[PDB]
Design an enzyme around this catalytic site. Sequence first.
Site, mmCIF file in Angstrom:
data_model
loop_
_atom_site.group_PDB
_atom_site.id
_atom_site.type_symbol
_atom_site.label_atom_id
_atom_site.label_comp_id
_atom_site.label_asym_id
_atom_site.label_seq_id
_atom_site.Cartn_x
_atom_site.Cartn_y
_atom_site.Cartn_z
ATOM 1 N N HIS A 41 0.830 -1.235 0.000
ATOM 2 C CA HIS A 41 0.000 0.000 0.000
ATOM 3 C C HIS A 41 0.858 1.277 0.000
ATOM 4 O O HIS A 41 0.284 2.359 -0.153
ATOM 5 C CB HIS A 41 -1.001 0.000 1.141
ATOM 6 N N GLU A 72 0.780 -8.411 0.609
ATOM 7 C CA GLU A 72 1.011 -7.033 1.136
ATOM 8 C C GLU A 72 2.506 -6.743 1.284
ATOM 9 O O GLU A 72 2.817 -5.682 1.883
ATOM 10 C CB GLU A 72 0.293 -6.829 2.469
ATOM 11 N N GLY A 146 1.660 5.492 10.946
ATOM 12 C CA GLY A 146 3.087 5.847 10.993
ATOM 13 C C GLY A 146 3.975 4.654 11.311
ATOM 14 O O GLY A 146 5.197 4.799 11.175
ATOM 15 N N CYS A 148 3.537 1.538 9.844
ATOM 16 C CA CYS A 148 3.573 0.607 8.665
ATOM 17 C C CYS A 148 5.000 0.543 8.130
ATOM 18 O O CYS A 148 5.670 1.604 8.020
ATOM 19 C CB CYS A 148 2.543 0.931 7.589
#
Length: 182
Positions: A41, A72, A146, A148
Amino acid sequence: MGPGFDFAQAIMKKNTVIARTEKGEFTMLGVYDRVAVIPTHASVGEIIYINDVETRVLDACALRDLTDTNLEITIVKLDRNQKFRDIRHFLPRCEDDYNDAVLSVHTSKFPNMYIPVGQVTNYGFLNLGGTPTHRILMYNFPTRAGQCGGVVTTTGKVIGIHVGGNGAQGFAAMLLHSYFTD
């Protein structure tokens, strides 16, 4: 503060960079040579900032499992003038549960951040931001925006990168040795 934080600090001080995309700033783990990982992402393009240096992306690959389900994890090869310490020998070979993990973050907003997240469950399937996702690790810590890309470690193992949360739990994408065979 203890041997968990010792292993986490050793990884952070040599194998992380600050990655900036159009979607913000992420903790980015360097694995070997010029190969790093980031949450998918982050939406890595042709150019990324690495510790505020404009850097060409030589290759980026959003990983999916052999059910063609989102993992992901994006693997990036950076046109960088310096290699990462090779840490592939710290990657697990198999999907697993863990005791006593640390989530470590380093950005402009959150420098030198280390979180004892405790027990890590092999959670498996998660609907992550509306995307079916596999190989998810779960920990009972209220993670936030913040964190990730944060690195999840035990003593001796780099097991995952933080990819989301629901306000009570945090979720990491597994790192497996088989992702980084050359």
